[PDB]
């Protein structure tokens, strides 16, 4: 028979209908001490009664209007479901013990219990707010249809919403049923496809224990995420939002789905300080005209077919039929969610719903024989239609709303919506909650061209105007990289700074990169900067210090030969001898020549003859210093014997192992030294050892006649002139020893021009200064 | 009402049961063009037949039982879901329209759902035997379901202990799209991230899941590098997915299979041997019923007039009808093969007889009863001529016995068992070729957290024929030399190993970022271990510092020699024509000069090069000073007073202390003692150059006279040299860092002091 509670009229052909007139069944448990009794239900829903007005409406309209069933009266058979499923499936055995269509519920375990049962008979069933995506599955739900869209396209919405502001750390929270488990799983799927890193994931619900919800709060406390999103409803989110609030838990960022996104249960203002500022989905909303004032009709002694009008009456104006009401009040003198709204977006789907099943039901009235949707082409009998028929005409039909839209059931029984997206905000006004528009969802368009969002209308935390921050890590600047955290995600990490060489030019960058062999890293490793060069050069401080001293040597010993040449009579000149003289000079021109090869860029052909001349040009010197002294042409074959014997040396020396140019990077990593080696050390041994030998017999033959005055006491200058060569020469040897930079190159042309100089000197100033 | 072929019996109480007997209906496009008809089902399933045989054995034994229900009848109404929800929604409305008083559940969980949704309106207990979602455990939605099987928390913890116990982090699962695989996978999912472990893909399967999706999955399959799937489904939603995999020949994986297809005889064939081999499974306990095989073989087409499924049963075993052939009603069940009587072990038919035992016990404490002590208002109870499903309902919630091995039962407030598990591994038979399961471990479930799983792994075949645990790894460890790096978009499993640069190293296998260790160490080339700091300093056993050692000590010898010889001629006329006192004095401090360079060896220490200079200064400015002059002692004293001064004021204002040079080099430490203020230094310096200048000038104006065997020009030749050699000095000082600045100062030293000696004494000492 049903529950005592309904609305029911009499009519030729009968509609059912389920709707939520409450929001949930007495907490008593029972122990089974005695028989068990019918539980009741504890608090009303304005919102629930209104779509059944709108169900009852659109009934009545239809019996109205003689152009889409003349002849023919529609009737209703409405329960209450109180949003469970013990008191829905109660009433949906008095519907197959008759119904052609019943007018779905709002939940989606209670509609899929409420479709397995139908389903068996295969009486249709349009639903209006059962979203679940597990109703899709046609092989199970073989009657269901839905005028509302499914939630894949919401969790992939709520995935483009957290890649449009650039969030990659959240936590989700959904409710223990067929709603909330399917989206976010779907949310899941899609986020981890966006690189999007989830903290937390917890469950709730309306019958949940205290410890559990200490455990969710606490969860959420010591995470350090900001964005939370949530998928389920108002009945099963308010005990959880009351315990945060009294915990005072805030600045968090909230992510609602369509369920609880406009509910009255959690919009309220002792909460606002907690859930401002909320973004949530909404679907769009219709018009239907006359309804509001159809709503405003509502009286519990006029509406004889309805009968949850009574409690609707005692429940808004607090009375009995505690003082008692004598019927006469107004229901705009008091402020429910009944009459009070801006859009109606269920409503809508509701009057839908009832128009599928009345034009399916012309469409079968319509039908002319032979051009039929059944066997031979045959047509159905109106006035003995059945329910598998209305379902496959249902499934056959398309029409178009009082807007102008086309409505179209899909293979799956779905229709396609768009979406809207709002946020929560205070009314200066009253301070209650107001939901303001701040973009939309397009369904139709293609993937990444779906989601429009005007950030300038958002307010982040109720008051606020700058986007929030949730990362789990300060990305850090260039120079430094990514490290790997233990036991975390990819999306929390510490960076380390980049070591010496490598640099890092853009930010968030996990490896530090290698400049080309020519190149070094800056002070703060950003750029790779050249690699200095570095040799003693002309145009440079000691390359012009020592070639202008060449240069005065060359133009002294120049002069020198001038004046020898020009006395070339004066019996002072003669006695010494003349073919030795200007070969001496000569040699000595040699020597300050070869003193500029050592400062210039190392060619391969300088460092090759750098070292051979200056050997050669001193050994031809001192051989000619060896023979000048008459207490030895004849003379002149000793000359050339030892210029031959150094060439000779310097020749093998060249042809066994040539010296090379060289750029070395080695000592130090900064600056590269293009200094060149000698190849070779026993042949520059011997190129030493050579001179030095003839040095040493030198000095000892002057040594020998040093007292003699003759010649301008000529043997104690040799000696000077040997003596300042040697120490000159024996100074610099840890400095050789010791080549480190472009110093090495100064010294040699140091000594070079001391061991000239002094040779010239001794020998020729006395014989100069006598002469002039 | 309800289904034509039926099991039925009469009785007082009546019992009802719901058997899977066919896997699935006949799925096909019903067009809706006349009026729909019934479905037909169409595989059998015999494992199915042998639970309805259990059911039926446990009530036969319980009415011929005397202690349990004397003077009672148990019936019963069983009716075949052939695996659908609509085909059992049907028997289950006849069971709520002679009264129904509890019900032996159903085997699917969705079904079971369905079933409880309408039998906890009428406070109809219902028992399942294989039902295992862990959403049927919450009492507000089903006020009268209990289970004699435990739900799919903890294997689903198992799972991931098995995962963690094999040392893998990178796997795929794959579910099915009903209410066991999805909280089922979800529970896992929870679980392996907690411990660390990684998922690469994760998909859902159904029996009629088109070829479109089948390939998608198993494209997926073939893209993902994981080798270990973790699969939580049936065998009639796996069935299509194991096909396709078996003809596109994809081997080489590693599954791990829940308890509903671990020994499902749909997916374990020879033919598909080579995609399945060595899978990994979970098993409930078996039970022990003594007379159950007899009664199984005791089925027949016309004496079992009570069972309607028996003539199916019999068409579908013998390939017959009651062109298939005729049959006669006496062949035997033993000469054909199917799961029927083919069984090593029963759970879910344990299962079966442990319901409806639970049930027969709640009416027998029913029954016995003393007023006064019942459980109902005023301690009275209720009557077993009326019974009444809510207090057979009150009873079951209030049970508690032993069954016939000897083990309590009981449920909890949630109407559910607990359980152990045991872990099997799929082989081959060697002697027919079939699959057989063999048991490798267990899962205890009344121990601590942590010490539940058991498993011996030398029992396990790994691909079917391999006896090496498989690598599942995303990448390959890192050794000691090196740290793994962020490979970007890809998660934290595999990473890429980055060498460690120079002054740091790494230790572990593992390292996520390789430390350094503090000064005076250094990386090796190897960069597993870091050695010390080298040190360098002159050294006394360096051949150098006894180069320079034994040259100071021959000069000091040399000193003492020449003052004996000058002590003991003290009476020769030439000692006389110099003055022997200053001789002395300038012999001793000559031999402060040579030993004022034993300073510069060794490592610096506190005061030594707090004191090098001072002294070499003093004995310097004292042996010109002697020479100069050569009372005069008190001139002596005046030029050396002042020295006094500036070196005593330099070591009490900064005085020099060793210092260590970190930031020259690398794997080299110098130290190199400061110079202090260099103020100090310079005046020195100068101060003591300034001295030779005038004495230099001061032995030039007189350098031509015999006197003295004409020593005055050898001063000069002193002092040039002396000069010449601190002179040419700064280009080897400035242009060389390291071990040689104090290498070429004890030379210049050693230079200065023995010319000074030698160009003065030697003449005097040759004529003695
Ligand atoms: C928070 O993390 C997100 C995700 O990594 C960052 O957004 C990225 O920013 C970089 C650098 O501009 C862009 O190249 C990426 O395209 C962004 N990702 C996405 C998905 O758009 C964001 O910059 C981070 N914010 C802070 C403050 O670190
Ligand atoms: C000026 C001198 N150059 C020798 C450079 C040198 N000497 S030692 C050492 C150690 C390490 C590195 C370099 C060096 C030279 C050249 C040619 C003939 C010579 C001669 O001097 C004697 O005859
Ligand atoms: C032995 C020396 N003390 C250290 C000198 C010194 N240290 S670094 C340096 C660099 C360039 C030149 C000199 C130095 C010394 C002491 C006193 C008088 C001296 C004298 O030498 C000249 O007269
Ligand atoms: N879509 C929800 C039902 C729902 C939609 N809008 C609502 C508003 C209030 C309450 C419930 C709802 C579900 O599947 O369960
Ligand atoms: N546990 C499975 C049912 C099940 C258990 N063992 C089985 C063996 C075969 C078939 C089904 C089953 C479920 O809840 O759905
Ligand atoms: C929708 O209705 C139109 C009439 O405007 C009809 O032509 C069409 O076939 C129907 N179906 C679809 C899928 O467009
Ligand atoms: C959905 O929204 C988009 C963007 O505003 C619009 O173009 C489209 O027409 C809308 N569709 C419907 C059916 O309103
Ligand atoms: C069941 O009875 C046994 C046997 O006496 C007892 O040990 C056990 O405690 C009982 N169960 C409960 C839940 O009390
Ligand atoms: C489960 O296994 C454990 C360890 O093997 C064992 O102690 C325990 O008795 C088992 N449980 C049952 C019910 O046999
Ligand atoms: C695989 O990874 C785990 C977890 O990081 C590690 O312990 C194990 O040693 C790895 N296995 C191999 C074979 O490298
Ligand atoms: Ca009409
Ligand atoms: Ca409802
Ligand atoms: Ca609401
Ligand atoms: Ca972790
Ligand atoms: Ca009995
Ligand atoms: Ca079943
Ligand atoms: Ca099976
Ligand atoms: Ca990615």
Not at 157 to 165: G, H, R, T
Not at 504 to 513: H, I, K, M, V, Y
Request: aromatic share 14%.
């Amino acid at each position: 028979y049903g529950p005592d509670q309904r609305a029911q009229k009499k009519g030729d052909i009968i509609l059912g209908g389920l709707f939520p007139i409450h929001f949930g069944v007495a907490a008593k448990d029972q122990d089974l001490k005695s028989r068990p009794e019918s539980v009741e239900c504890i608090r009303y829903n304005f919102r629930g009664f209104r779509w059944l007005q709108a169900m009852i409406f659109a009934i009545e309209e239809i019996n109205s209007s003689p152009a889409l069933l003349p002849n023919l009266t529609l009737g209703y058979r409405i329960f209450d479901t109180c949003n469970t499923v013990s008191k829905a499936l109660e009433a949906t055995l008095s519907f197959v013990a008759s119904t052609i269509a019943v007018v779905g519920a709002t939940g989606s375990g209670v509609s899929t219990a409420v479709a397995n049962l139908l389903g068996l008979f295969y009486i249709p069933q349009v639903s209006y707010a059962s979203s679940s995506r597990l109703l899709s599955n046609k092989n199970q739900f073989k009657s269901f249809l839905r005028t509302i869209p499914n939630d894949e396209h919401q969790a992939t919405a709520m995935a483009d919403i957290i890649e449009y502001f650039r969030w990659n750390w959240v936590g989700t929270i959904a409710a223990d049923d067929d709603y909330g488990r399917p989206g976010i799983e779907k949310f899941r799927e899609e986020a981890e496809e966006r690189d999007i890193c989830i903290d937390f994931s917890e469950l709730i619900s309306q019958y949940s224990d205290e410890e559990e919800i200490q455990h969710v709060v606490e969860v959420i406390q010591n995470s350090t995420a900001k964005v939370i999103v949530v998928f389920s409803s108002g009945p099963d989110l308010e005990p959880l939002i009351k315990e945060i609030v009294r915990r005072n838990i805030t600045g968090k960022i909230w992510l609602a789905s369509e369920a609880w996104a406009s509910s009255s249960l959690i919009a309220m203002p002792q909460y606002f300080h907690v859930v401002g500022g909320t973004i949530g989905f909404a679907l769009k909303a219709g018009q239907i005209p006359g309804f509001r004032e159809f709503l405003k009709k509502v009286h519990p002694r006029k509406s004889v077919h309805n009968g949850f009008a009574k409690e609707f009456w005692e429940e808004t104006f607090n009375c009995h039929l505690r003082p008692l009401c004598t019927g006469d009040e107004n229901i705009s003198s008091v402020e429910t969610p009944y009459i009070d709204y801006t859009h109606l977006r269920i409503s809508y789907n509701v009057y839908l719903a009832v128009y599928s099943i009345a034009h399916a039901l012309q469409d079968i009235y319509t039908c002319l024989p032979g051009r039929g949707l059944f066997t031979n082409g045959s047509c159905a009998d109106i006035k003995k239609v059945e329910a598998w028929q209305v379902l496959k005409h249902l499934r056959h039909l398309n029409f178009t709303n009082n807007m102008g839209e086309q409505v179209t059931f899909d293979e799956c029984g779905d229709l396609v919506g768009n979406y809207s997206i709002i946020n929560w905000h205070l009314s200066p006004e009253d301070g209650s909650i107001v939901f303001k528009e701040v973009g939309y969802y397009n369904v139709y368009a293609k993937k990444g061209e779906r989601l429009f969002i005007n950030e300038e209308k958002i307010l982040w935390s109720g008051f606020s105007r700058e986007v929030p921050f949730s990362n789990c890590s300060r990305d850090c600047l260039a120079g430094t990289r990514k490290g790997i955290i233990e036991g975390e995600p990819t999306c929390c990490f510490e960076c380390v700074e980049c070591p010496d060489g490598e640099y890092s030019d853009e930010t968030d960058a996990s490896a530090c990169n290698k400049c080309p062999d020519d190149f070094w890293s800056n002070e703060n490793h950003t750029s790779c900067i050249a690699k200095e060069i570095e040799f003693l050069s002309w145009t440079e401080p000691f390359g012009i210090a020592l070639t202008l001293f060449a240069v005065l040597g060359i133009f002294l010993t120049a002069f020198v030969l001038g004046v020898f040449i020009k006395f070339r009579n004066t019996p002072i000149v003669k006695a010494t001898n003349r073919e030795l003289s200007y070969l001496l000079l000569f040699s000595l021109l040699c020597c300050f020549s070869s003193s500029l090869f050592f400062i210039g860029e190392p060619q391969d052909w300088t460092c090759r003859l750098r070292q051979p001349a200056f050997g050669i040009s001193f050994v031809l010197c001192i051989s000619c210093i060896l023979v000048k002294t008459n207490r030895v042409n004849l003379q002149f074959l000793l000359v050339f014997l030892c210029t031959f014997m150094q060439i000779v040396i310097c020749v093998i020396w060249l042809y066994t192992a040539p010296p090379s140019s060289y750029r070395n990077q080695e000592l130090e990593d900064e600056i590269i030294f293009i200094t060149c080696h000698e190849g070779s050390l026993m042949a520059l041994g011997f190129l030493i050892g050579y001179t030095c030998l003839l040095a040493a017999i030198c000095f000892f033959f002057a040594f020998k006649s040093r007292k003699l005055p003759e010649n301008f006491n000529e043997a104690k200058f040799i000696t000077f002139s040997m003596l300042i060569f040697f120490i000159v020469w024996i100074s610099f040897i840890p400095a050789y020893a010791s080549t480190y930079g472009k110093f090495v190159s100064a010294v040699e042309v140091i000594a070079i021009l001391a061991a000239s100089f002094g040779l010239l000197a001794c020998i020729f100033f006395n014989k100069i200064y006598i002469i002039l």
